[PDB]
Design a protein around this ligand. Structure first.
Ligand code: HEM
Ligand code: HEM
Lengths: 137, 137
């Protein structure tokens, strides 16, 4: 289920985090504009950058804590507030998160590993609603 | 589902509030001690007492407000704090609330009417968690 999925991802986190984030950037290549130096590179070239695995791992470390502090796939408002107030996310709107979760759910459905993909879709929807409640445009 | 149940109960709030509150007292008769004016009264005598219909409808109106503001049956912590800080609830513990929700779910499963009874049991569990976080014993 969703709670065990968090342990699945945590057990091989840099591999899942890069694979999911690459699925997001390949599904929505225009989203590369929020990052620096990601355009113009294939997946293997991104994975050998200095910063790419380390930053994607940090993103998923935090995503999994948000998911673990949730009840029934509903994140805490304080975790939504932190994501809205991070200076690194000052340019974003909730649509950027919904695209990330659409790609994440598609990855889980396609994978050989069992995941509770419907609960990740619901968690993404609930996080978008919480980000909007916390004031993201 | 749970959102429709809020509308079903709302639509005839006096009748459902009285029926569920009496199901509570009749399953857990020791709970009637907290309502000193209802001691020794039949159900029709209760229904002749203005405060009984008025105050039970108010209880259920507030429950429905808390249920409608929940996300995926997870209530707001602010709503749990209201219920804990009410002077009328000074002497209670989370087990009183657990009893009410066991009776409410039993009533739903026995009724003709369709209800998403599993969701009301999970809402009751999540609400007792939030009452305890908000300082109920
Ligand atoms: C629940 C979803 C997300 C979480 C948990 C999250 C978390 C974080 C974290 C922890 C960092 C710090 C990375 C570091 O400095 O090492 C970061 C940076 C950043 N985030 Fe997010 N983020 C999320 C979603 C998004 C989305 C959807 C976008 C844009 C489409 C985005 C754009 C950015 C950018 C531009 C940075 C700084 C640039 C960089 O790391 O290269 N984030 N994020
Ligand atoms: C989610 C569940 C509950 C809600 C929403 C709730 C709500 C309320 C409200 C709105 C009132 C004020 C009624 C008025 O003055 O008109 C009230 C009074 C009161 N509540 Fe609750 N209550 C809940 C659970 C409980 C439980 C489980 C108990 C005890 C076993 C309890 C014991 C009482 C008592 C003793 C009063 C004062 C009686 C009166 O003056 O009518 N409540 N409640």
């Amino acid at each position: 289920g969703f709670k065990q999925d968090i342990a699945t991802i945590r057990g091989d986190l840099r591999t899942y985090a890069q694979d999911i984030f690459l699925a997001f950037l390949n599904k929505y290549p225009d989203e590369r504009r929020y990052f620096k130096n990601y355009v113009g590179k294939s997946d293997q070239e991104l994975k050998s950058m200095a910063k790419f695995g380390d930053h994607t791992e940090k993103v998923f470390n935090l995503m999994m804590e948000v998911a673990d502090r949730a009840t029934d796939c509903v994140p805490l408002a304080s975790d939504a507030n932190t994501l809205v107030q991070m200076k690194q996310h000052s340019s974003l709107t909730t649509g950027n998160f919904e695209k990330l979760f659409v790609a994440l759910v598609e990855y889980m459905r396609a994978s050989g590993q069992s995941f509770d993909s419907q609960s990740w879709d619901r968690f993404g929807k609930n996080l978008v609603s919480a980000l909007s409640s916390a004031g993201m445009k």
